[PDB]
Design a protein around this ligand. Sequence first.
Ligand SMILES: COC[C@H]1CN(Cc2ccccn2)C(=O)[C@@H]2CCC[C@H]1N2S(=O)(=O)c1ccc2ncsc2c1
Length: 128
Amino acid sequence: GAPATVTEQGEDITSKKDRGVLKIVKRVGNGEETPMIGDKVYVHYKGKLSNGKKFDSSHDRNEPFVFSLGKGQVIKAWDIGVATMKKGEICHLLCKPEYAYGSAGSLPKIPSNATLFFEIELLDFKGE
Ligand SMILES: COC[C@H]1CN(Cc2ccccn2)C(=O)[C@@H]2CCC[C@H]1N2S(=O)(=O)c1ccc2ncsc2c1
């Protein structure tokens, strides 16, 4: 399925080249521009654990998830991966625990040492 495919066929987008964050572009977005550090970014996403369970979805809430890019408001894999996206892009990201919740996990939904799968859609980005 999609998690296997990004694991085996994804691009390593880490600066360290440690395969900690792998990406596939699923829907090509608009032009060349990507958000910059500090932009307000608006996304839709779904996240799955390596056991196949969906742990979260913004579409199920009928509202986007909003954060300031590059400020550690989200897991490292998102600061790295959303920074690569064009407006309107949909991507798959495979996030090893060192770029996610590590050995701590996130109680209650994410276990220790969890590799996470996301589908992310970059809806918009704005400088405030
Ligand atoms: C609604 O969740 C928003 C956001 C959470 N954070 C930041 C954060 C703040 C405080 C504590 C932990 N994490 C994230 O970095 C990542 C990536 C952005 C999207 C979300 N997650 S998540 O991995 O999908 C996730 C993780 C745990 C969780 N518990 C129940 S729902 C759920 C969602």
